[PDB]
Design a binder for this molecule. Structure first.
Ligand SMILES: Cn1cc(-c2ccc(C(=O)Nc3cc(-c4ccccc4)ccc3N)cc2)c2cc[nH]c2c1=O
Length: 125
């Protein structure tokens, strides 16, 4: 179909291990953004069919969304905090390169990104 399969969220042969930073990314970063009033465009993969964005997956080579990130954190998919930070960055990049700068969706992403950056600047060592 027009939409790809969603990104993988389970890492079956990776050992499960906590880190301080991954705890922070789930319990502080993801939780804060997930509950934000503007989270809803970002809580699941973009549905190009329902949104009538037939070129979305032409332009966006690496789909990413917070529902995927949440599942990855809850499944201990990431080997390190930087992979998770990269996924957040990719999500925001996708929004900014696809949508018009004045789109309400872009303005919502910018508010979430500011909060993301504020929390990441306090990432523990
Ligand atoms: C990342 N992203 C997401 C969306 C998007 C937009 C809308 C939705 C969505 O769930 N839309 C929706 C909102 C309400 C709603 C929200 C607030 C108040 C009232 C009603 C209801 C139903 C639906 N389907 C998802 C996703 C999008 C649209 C154009 N470009 C992008 C983009 O880059």
């Amino acid at each position: 179909s027009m939409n790809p399969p969603p990104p993988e969220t389970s890492n079956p042969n990776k050992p499960k291990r906590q880190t301080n930073q991954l705890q922070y990314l789930l319990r502080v970063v993801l939780k804060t953004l997930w509950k934000h009033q503007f989270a809803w465009p970002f809580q699941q993969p973009v549905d190009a069919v329902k949104l009538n964005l037939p070129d979305y997956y032409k332009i966006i080579k690496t789909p990413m969304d917070m529902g995927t990130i949440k599942k990855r954190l809850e499944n201990n998919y990431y080997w390190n905090a930087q992979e998770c930070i990269q996924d957040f960055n990719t999500m925001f990049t996708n929004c900014y390169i696809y949508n018009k700068p004045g789109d309400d969706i872009v303005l919502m992403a910018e508010a979430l990104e500011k909060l993301f950056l504020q929390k990441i600047n306090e990432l523990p060592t």
